[PDB]
């Protein structure tokens with residue numbers, strides 16, 4: 001009943017160009033079986049959305065990587081929010097949404113925007129830059145660690161740790177196992193900064209620790225919640241902003257529209273998240289035999305969702321393969337959906353918005369002027385290097 005496919009969605013060939021294999025996965029059926037890793041797969045919008053919005057049947061407390069925490073020891077203590085189910089998930093989730101709240105954005109927006117404008121001015125002085133290292137990486141590095149309240153020393157561990165975490169959701173391929181080796185220094189840095197004395201006052205970190213008073217989290221839970229933000233708060237935003245710049249470089253008509261109305265900046269970023277979906281995939285585990293679409297999945301089975309595929313499903317999107325900064329993106333799953341929906345989405349959107357606004361107002365053209373280097377990661381899609389010529393407006 002369920003088609004079996006030999007596609008390895010964690011192979012370098014797949015990462016290099018996933019779109020054809022994603023149409024094959026969508027068109028094979030609403031539920032496929034991936035013989036390479038003995039997991040179920042869902043690549044259409046409808047089933048991806050369904051799985052994300054049934055956390056009782058498709059749980060996260062058995063890990064959202066390939067590994068089943070019921071069967072193997074997690075490579076690090078489980079995240080209290082990503083790798084938890086309701087009700088244990090609920091109060092830690094509420095703390096993080098209050099920490100990363102609409103009201104919190106008001107306190108950081110002006111500083112994030114001035115830093116975005118200053119970076120674009122700096123890049124315009126150099127002209128030929130790497131839109132990854134000099135922009136997509138540099139800008140979030142210039143605002144997020146400080147907003148966390150992190151000290152200056154050791155920030156070089158942050159991006160390596162984030163890439164490890166994302167690779168670790170993957171199967172035990174050499175990307176993952178090489179990341180887990182080589183990981184000890186990054187883990188020790190990150191874990192130490194999660195301790196209250198190391199988090200500057202007013203920052204996101206100290207704000208998490210300040211919620212240990214309410215009955216929502218206990219003091220021994222606060223370091224792991226800080227770890228969550230240091231795990232998830234940087235690399236995807238870098239690659240989301242990298243995606244947007246890449247899109248504007250490949251679709252000059254869209255840059256011209258953005259320049260003509262910079263208030264499109266926020267939706268231009270949202271569309272880049274749909275179009276390139278920095279978080280490509282992750283898993284749920286069935287707590288129960290379930291009929292998904294029209295297929296039966298046993299208990300205790302890993303289910304791989306293809307978020308980027310669902311965001312390009314022609315069953316849900318008109319011209320899914322076009323970057324359209326005026327598209328109604330509402331409903332894309334680039335930030336997930338349901339109870340785990342990205343709790344840091346307001347920070348990502350703010351960072352992406354103020355950067356695209358700075359470019360919208362200051363840049364006339366973005367031309368690729370060197371070899372584009374892709375990043376290969378078991379769950380992240382993004383760029384290693386994106387040489388561009390920025391022409392000032």
Ligand code: HEM
Pocket residue numbers: 060064081082083093096100228229232233234236237240241273277278279282307333334335336337339340341342343344345347348
């Ligand atoms: C473009 C940038 C980002 C993308 C594409 C993204 C993507 C996602 C996705 C798809 C999920 C759902 C995971 C699941 O359902 O299992 C998620 C959850 C999460 N994200 Fe984001 N994220 C981004 C930025 C951020 C930022 C800036 C932060 C923190 C400042 C953050 C922190 C988190 C956390 C803690 C979770 C777990 C939420 C939960 O389990 O309730 N992310 N992210």
Ligand SMILES: CC(=O)[C@@](C)(O)c1ccc(C(=O)O)cc1
Pocket residue numbers: 064079080081082083165166227228229231232236279282
């Ligand atoms: C899988 C995902 O969506 C991502 C990358 O944003 C994420 C990574 C780690 C955590 C955590 O709690 O440590 C939360 C989210």
Ligand SMILES: [Cl-]
Pocket residue numbers: 076187190191227
């Ligand atoms: Cl860790």
